[PDB]
């Protein structure tokens, strides 16, 4: 299987620094871009940074919120990605995940850092086993198109993230066939054809905007009965 194991989190004072590490196994790490994404109760899921390949001169890009303070880097010889965090602020508090592949198939377990465009989804939907339910993802800039490479990621309890769909319509390896991704009208959509009890979870969509990602607020899916 694929594992992304994080380390480095902890308590740090405002103005402080911390370095996070993530070691990958089970896939050809060096062939894929890597990202850091953080979660806070306040700001939800927030994409932080990406790093591309050796053939891209390890090019990086950052969220505006961290640009000039955070540095993402990788060591392909150690199958590892890192995040150096400087000049930390209270708003940087959160659970930090390394994630990547097509485009957010794999997520680490998260490491907690304590410093002490809108993508719209349905807040909640209720379904029952065997029903067909469609979750949607809207962009504040206009239509969602294939240029937004919509991804769908599932969060189950204990902050367990799994990528389900990437590139609008592509089912991540070993993802159940009842999940499918598409564009419906001006939105991206996740359809579950025959919802199952265990599908009760929070589902986040992510959209790409030229050089960065924006995550929706998540949909809490209840599967009653």
């Amino acid at each position: 299987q694929v594992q992304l194991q994080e380390s480095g989190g902890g308590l740090v004072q405002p103005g402080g620094s911390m370095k996070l590490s993530c070691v990958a196994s089970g896939f050809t790490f060096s062939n894929y871009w890597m990202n850091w994404v953080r979660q806070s109760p306040e700001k939800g899921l927030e994409w932080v940074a990406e790093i591309r390949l050796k053939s891209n001169n390890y090019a990086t890009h950052y969220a505006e919120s961290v640009k000039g303070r955070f540095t993402i880097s990788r060591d392909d010889s150690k199958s590892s990605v890192y995040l150096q965090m400087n000049n930390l602020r209270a708003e940087d508090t959160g659970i930090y995940y390394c994630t990547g592949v097509g485009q957010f198939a794999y997520w680490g377990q998260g490491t907690t850092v304590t410093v002490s465009i809108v993508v719209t989804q349905e807040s909640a939907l209720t379904t029952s086993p065997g029903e067909t339910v469609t979750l949607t993802c809207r962009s504040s800039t206009g239509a969602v198109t294939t240029s937004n490479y919509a991804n769908w990621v599932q969060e189950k309890p204990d902050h367990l993230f799994t990528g389900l769909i990437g590139g609008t319509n592509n089912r991540a390896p070993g993802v159940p066939a009842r999940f499918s991704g598409s564009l419906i009208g001006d939105k991206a959509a996740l359809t579950i054809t025959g919802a199952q009890t265990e599908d009760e979870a929070i589902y986040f969509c992510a959209l790409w905007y030229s050089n960065h990602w924006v995550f929706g607020g998540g949909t809490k899916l209840t599967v009653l009965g």
Binding site: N31, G100, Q103, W208
Partner: peptide, 6 residues
Amino acid sequence: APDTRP
């Protein structure tokens, strides 16, 4: 595009 490698 982002990382489109399968």
